[PDB]
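Hi R.,

Here are the chain sequences for the assembly we discussed:
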Amino acid sequence: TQELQTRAKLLDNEIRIFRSELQRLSHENNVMLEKIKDNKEKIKNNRQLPYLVANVVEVMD
Amino acid sequence: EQEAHNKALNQFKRKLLEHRRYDDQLKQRRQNIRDLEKLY
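And here is the predicted structure of the full complex:
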């Protein structure tokens, strides 16, 4: 009953730090998602009509 | 129940189980930010 009372007091400090780390990744993952939308609304305007049609002589790479 | 350290331990078990939903959420969000890095 001394080991399980010190074990339980190790999950109160361990879960307090893991909530702080996960609040930093939530704010960060909303800033990254608006960079993918940003690029793509540009990319949507060029993709639609009209565009010439040509063939590939060679891929030179 | 048997002890008043076995009534403090039914609530400690809940916390232990929860620690299992904070370990799967931190390994998920680092696996989801590397997948959104290849898409950016």
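The interface with chain B takes residues 1, 4-5, 7-8, 11-12, 14-15, 18-19, 21-22, 25-26, 28-29, 32-33, 35-36, 39 of chain A (CB under 8 Å). Helices of chain A lie at 3-47.

Let me know if anything looks off.

Best,
T.
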